[PDB]
């Protein structure tokens, strides 16, 4: 059973330092080529660094001079020391067994990954706004309504409807990172327009990092 | 009495870098102008000596080491370098005195389908010492379980075939390399230039 | 310098189909190539190494082929667990460039989106910002264009959009587009409209409101 277990990820400010660990089982780290590969949110994969059994190290151009790959033979662990972190270093970082240059075997075993978020943003709970159903132009049977969960950091937020009693037709969108460095997300639900006057619709927003719990009643706007 | 450089540079076959060839050159007159005024080499770098002044120099012995590597690995054949070649195949010392000469050999060393006769050491626990040659083919233990000559999980064949194809990018094509080491000991000089 | 061009970006397929994913290297890289499969929130998984060697444990329906510049990954009879993103990777030189990726998604009947526009709430307007939201609900295929118009002026650089993963029940997508303006800019205009182009629509559907419920 081969295991690559990572730790060390977390939130850090630009210019800060972080150290990632990768405890291995099922092979000897010091006897192998060992790599770090990273994946920015919603992006592809990018090789970062490699350490050879003899001690040679290589780095991708973007991290050269800032990152240091290392290992501890006694602990059978691989390390990534990340200094002078930039916002573009935000990624899930994976350790993997193998090399990428003249190495036909590829990266056969990978760790579970560890998220590193590099940001100057402050932890903030979201503001919750209604996306009121269009009563002023009632559709043929189905209305849509929702909540705009705006300006929070870091991820994640959880959204439920009517304390979990409303699940059908719900779409909670992936958050977008705004230029301010805060996230924004919408949660929508399609319902029978016949129910707009008789059924109460409340979105339950939870944001654990700021201990925020908001319930927002979404009503058809009065004219 | 001319130094047999043609034997080295114009050899029909070159060695694999892991099993690099060494030819002791002694008791002869060496004309380095034959090599230096030839525009057939993509690499011609000297260390501890000037390439123009070689014809007015005398050495105890000259070693000519030859092998094949990719074009992008020729940079590893220099003092103070790292990589799969410098580390596990052919290592120059920091105090290297001599010349490193290279040229693209795609028309001789690559074939359609791949030339699997040229190899390099991919796996080795520690780096080679300068001028060390390791020709072992024993199964490489990458974990705690012994291999017992059996290839498989955490049990690698230490050498990798280059598989040179003519359709490879120029930096991945085979390059013939000759390393001249100039030895100066407290003994008679057997290799002098044209005097 | 090696460029890897993986195609297609998206591949629509059904369970039991034979699927091929292509990877093109800008120069000859022999058999130094690997194929990976990745599922959302999970680490990549090696399928094929040395361009055509099936990694141990990987199903026989997965196979790699090619040498030099043109590589293909074939899945001979697609299973539900195969809908994932696939990546090629060059193993010839640093930095071991990965391909852009191929999302293997589920084929279904064409479905036009239901379009909804939402004006900013009065609560949001009080704090100085106005978010206008356009929802495209349960459509197929994934390709759709949302164009924001403010008093007929085509808006650019002031909107962000988000798409859900393919629905596990009906295999459709839903898309949200948000137009962000300052309250002062929002109040300088009357007509807010989000024009939607999709294969399921005969012509582009427009949803609009006039500021101040006009
Ligand atoms: C190798 O062969 C060429 C062609 O005959 C010749 O010009 C050259 O001088 C030879 N090289 C050496 C080192 O003798």
Check which CATH number belongs to the domain holding A174 and give it. 2.60.40.10
Domain boundary among A81, A100, A118: A118
Angle, vertex CA A193, rays to CA A190 and CA A199, nearest 5: 85
β-partners of residue C196 are C146, C205
- Chain C residues whose beta carbon lies within 8 Å of the beta carbon of residue B167: 28, 68-69
Give B164 to chain C, closest Cα distance, Å: 8
Check if the beta carbon of residue C92 is closer than 8 Å to that of residue C45.
no
The DSSP output letter for A69 is E
Q: Which two tokens stand for residue A206?
A: 């939870």
Domain assignment of residue A107, yes or no:
yes
Nearest to C90 by CA among C42, C44, C23: C23
B32 Cβ below 6 A of ligand 1 = no
Domain boundary among A101, A118, A135: A118
Q: Which two tokens stand for residue B133?
A: 């040659």
The DSSP output letter for B55 is G
**Candidates C97, C118, C176; nearest CB to A132:** C118
Q: Which two tokens stand for residue A13?
A: 């400010």
Q: Which two tokens stand for residue B57?
A: 């120099």
Note whether A95 and A133 are same-domain residues: no
Secondary structure, 3-state, chain C: CCCEEEECCEEEECCCCCEEEEEEECCECCCCEEEEEECCCCCCEEEEECCCEECCCCCCCEEEECCCCEEEEEECCCCHHHCCEEEEEECCCCCCCECCCEEEEECCCCECCEEEEECCCHHHHHCCEEEEEEEEEEEECCCEEEEEEECCEECCCCEEEEECCCCCCCCCEEEEEEEEEEHHHHCCCCEEEEEEEECCCCCCECCEEECCCC
Greatest Cα pair distance, chain A, in angstroms, is 76
3-class SS of residue A21: strand
What phi, psi does B80 have (nearest 5°)? 70, 25
Our count of domains for chain A comes to 2
Domain assignment of residue A80, yes or no:
yes
Tell me the CA–centroid distance for residue B6 and ligand 1, in Å: 6
The answer to whether the CB atoms of C27 and B168 lie below 8 A apart is yes
Note whether A57 and A151 are same-domain residues: no
Q: Is B110 left (phi over 0), alpha (psi -120 to 50) or beta?
A: beta
The answer to whether the CB atoms of C131 and A184 lie below 8 A apart is yes
Nearest to B119 by CA among B128, B127, B129, B109: B109
A34's CB contacts (< 8 A; 6+ apart) are: A22, A50, A51, A69, A71, A78, A95, A96, A97, A98
Q: Is A89 left (phi over 0), alpha (psi -120 to 50) or beta?
A: alpha
Residue span of the structural domain in which A63 resides: 3-118
B9 Cβ below 6 A of ligand 1 = yes
Contact with chain C for residue A26, Cβ under 8 A? no
Domain assignment of residue B125, yes or no:
no
Note whether A212 and A110 are same-domain residues: no
CA distance A28 to A24: 8
Contact with chain C for residue A52, Cβ under 8 A? no
Length of chain A: 223
Method for this entry: X-ray
Note whether A112 and A160 are same-domain residues: no
Q: Is C54 left (phi over 0), alpha (psi -120 to 50) or beta?
A: beta
Handedness of CA A190, A191, A197, A201 (dihedral sign): negative
**Candidates A27, A55, A104; nearest CB to B142:** A27
Note whether A10 and A33 are same-domain residues: yes
Where do the domains of chain C lie, and which CATH numbers do they carry? 4-106 (2.60.40.10), 114-210 (2.60.40.10)
Give A63 to chain C, closest Cα distance, Å: 12
CATH code of the domain containing B52: 3.30.70.1840
Check if the beta carbon of residue C183 is closer than 8 Å to that of residue C130.
yes
How far from chain centre, in Å, is Cα A104? 31
Domain assignment of residue A223, yes or no:
no
**Secondary element (H or E) of residue B44:** strand B43-47
B11 Cβ below 6 A of ligand 1 = no
Residue span of the structural domain in which B96 resides: 5-118+164-192
Tell me the CA–centroid distance for residue B103 and ligand 1, in Å: 13
Check if the beta carbon of residue A101 is closer than 8 Å to that of residue A152.
no
Half-sphere exposure of A130 (CA within 13 A, CB side): 17
Atom of ligand 1 nearest to the CA of B34: 9
Q: Which two tokens stand for residue A153?
A: 């950091």
Note whether A99 and A143 are same-domain residues: no
Note whether A48 and A112 are same-domain residues: yes
- Chain C residues whose beta carbon lies within 8 Å of the beta carbon of residue A42: none
State the alpha helices, DSSP H only, in chain B. 5-9, 33-36, 84-88, 106-109
Our count of domains for chain B comes to 1
CA distance A47 to A143: 47
Domain assignment of residue B124, yes or no:
no
Q: Which two tokens stand for residue B147?
A: 């291999």
Note whether A105 and A78 are same-domain residues: yes
Tell me the CA–centroid distance for residue B92 and ligand 1, in Å: 26
Check if the beta carbon of residue C51 is closer than 8 Å to that of residue C24.
no
Note whether A50 and A95 are same-domain residues: yes
Domain boundary among A118, A151, A180: A118
Check if the beta carbon of residue B29 is closer than 8 Å to that of residue B158.
no
- Torsion angle, alpha carbons of A215, A216, A217, A219, to 10: -170
Note whether A15 and A48 are same-domain residues: yes
Q: Strands of B43-47's sheet, edge to edge?
A: B21-25, B61-70, B174-183, B98-104, B43-47
CA distance B51 to B182: 12
Nearest to C92 by CA among B110, B119, A100: A100
């Amino acid at each position: 059973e081969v295991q690559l277990v990572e730790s060390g990820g977390g939130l850090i400010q630009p210019g800060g330092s972080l150290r990632l660990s990768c405890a291995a089982s099922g092979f000897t780290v010091s006897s192998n080529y060992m790599s770090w590969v990273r994946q920015a949110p919603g992006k592809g994969l990018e090789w970062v660094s490699v350490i050879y059994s003899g001690g040679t190290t290589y780095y991708a151009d973007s991290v050269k001079g800032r990152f240091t790959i290392s290992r501890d033979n006694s602990k059978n662990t691989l390390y990534l020391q990340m200094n002078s972190l930039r916002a573009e270093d935000t990624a899930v970082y994976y350790c993997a067994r193998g090399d990428v240059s003249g190495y036909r075997y590829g990266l056969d075993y990978w760790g579970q990954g560890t998220l590193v978020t590099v940001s100057g943003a402050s932890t903030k709970g979201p503001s919750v706004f209604p996306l009121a159903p269009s009563s002023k132009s009632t559709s043929g049977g189905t209305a849509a309504l929702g909540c705009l969960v705006k300006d929070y950091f870091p991820e994640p937020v959880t959204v439920s409807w009517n304390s979990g009693a409303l699940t059908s037709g719900v779409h909670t969108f992936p958050a977008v990172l705004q230029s301010s460095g805060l996230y924004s997300l919408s949660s929508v639900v399609t319902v029978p327009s016949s129910s707009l006057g008789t059924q109460t619709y409340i979105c339950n927003v939870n944001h654990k990092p700021s201990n925020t719990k908001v319930d927002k009643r979404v009503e058809p706007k009065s004219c | 009495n001319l130094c047999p450089f043609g034997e080295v540079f114009n050899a029909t076959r070159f060695a694999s870098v892991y099993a690099w060839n060494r030819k002791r050159i002694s008791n002869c007159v060496a004309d380095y102008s034959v090599l230096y005024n030839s525009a057939s080499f993509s690499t011609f770098k000297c260390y501890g000596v000037s390439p123009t002044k070689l014809n007015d120099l005398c050495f105890t012995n000259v070693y000519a080491d030859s092998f094949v590597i990719r074009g992008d690995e020729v940079r590893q054949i220099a003092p103070g370098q790292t990589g799969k070649i410098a580390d596990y195949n052919y290592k120059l010392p920091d105090d290297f005195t001599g010349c490193v000469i290279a040229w693209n050999s795609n028309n001789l060393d690559s074939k359609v389908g791949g030339n699997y006769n040229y190899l390099y050491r991919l796996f080795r626990k520690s780096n080679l010492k300068p001028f060390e040659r390791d020709i072992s083919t024993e199964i490489y233990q990458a974990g705690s379980t012994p291999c017992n000559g059996v290839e498989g999980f955490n049990c690698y064949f230490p050498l990798q075939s280059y598989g040179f194809q003519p359709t490879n990018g120029v930096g991945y094509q085979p390059y013939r390399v000759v390393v001249l080491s100039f030895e100066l000991l407290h003994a008679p000089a057997t290799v002098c230039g044209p005097k | 310098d090696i460029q890897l061009t993986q195609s297609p970006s998206s591949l629509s397929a059904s369970v039991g189909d034979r699927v091929t994913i292509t990877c093109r290297a800008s120069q000859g890289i022999s058999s130094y190539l690997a194929w990976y499969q990745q599922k959302p929130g999970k680490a990549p998984k090696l399928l094929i190494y040395a361009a055509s060697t099936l990694e141990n444990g990987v199903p026989s329906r997965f196979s790699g082929s090619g040498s030099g510049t043109d590589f293909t990954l074939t899945i001979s009879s697609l299973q539900p667990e195969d809908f994932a993103t696939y990546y090629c990777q060059q193993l010839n030189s640093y930095p071991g460039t990965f391909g852009q990726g191929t999302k293997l998604e589920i084929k279904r009947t064409v479905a036009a989106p239901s379009v909804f526009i939402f004006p900013p709430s009065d609560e949001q307007l009080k704090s100085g910002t106005a978010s206008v939201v356009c929802l495209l609900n349960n459509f197929y295929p994934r390709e759709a264009k949302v164009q924001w118009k403010v008093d007929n002026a085509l808006q650019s650089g002031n909107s962000q959009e988000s798409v859900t993963e393919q629905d596990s029940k009906d295999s459709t997508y839903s898309l949200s587009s948000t137009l962000t303006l300052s309250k002062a800019d929002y109040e300088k205009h009357k007509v807010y409209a989000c024009e939607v182009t999709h294969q399921g629509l005969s012509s582009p559907v427009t949803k609009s409101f006039n500021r101040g419920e006009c």
